[PDB]
């Protein structure tokens, strides 16, 4: 739904921690040689784009979490399908 001014209750620290969740949910990895890699930096940058997009498209905090969850799912599903079809 539409909850006017729901942005006023979303701190920057929450959005930043949500971005960290998107990254770990799409590409969890212990290897420290990943955080420095450019293929991982493209993931953090894509996570910030999605979070930014859903922060403006959503109209309530419940829509926010819902859309973010569906974008993570679609990307996980894509990774899992190409991972299984990989030569």
């Amino acid at each position: 739904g539409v909850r006017k001014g729901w942005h006023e209750h979303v701190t920057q620290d929450l959005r930043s921690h949500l971005v960290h969740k998107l990254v770990q949910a799409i590409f969890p990895t212990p290897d420290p040689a990943a955080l420095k890699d450019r293929r991982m930096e493209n993931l953090v940058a894509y996570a910030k784009k999605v979070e930014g997009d859903m922060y403006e498209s959503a109209n309530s905090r419940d829509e926010y979490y819902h859309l973010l969850a569906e974008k993570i799912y679609k990307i996980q599903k894509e990774l899992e399908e190409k991972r299984r079809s990989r030569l």
Partner: peptide, 26 residues
């Protein structure tokens, strides 16, 4: 057709929503 779709979306929603409390933290 990925019957676990609804399940996985809800698990991810809980994942994200649980960030509000853990920012209480220390």
């Amino acid at each position: 057709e990925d019957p676990e779709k609804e399940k996985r979306i809800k698990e991810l929603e809980l994942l994200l929503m649980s960030t509000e409390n853990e920012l209480k933290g220390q």
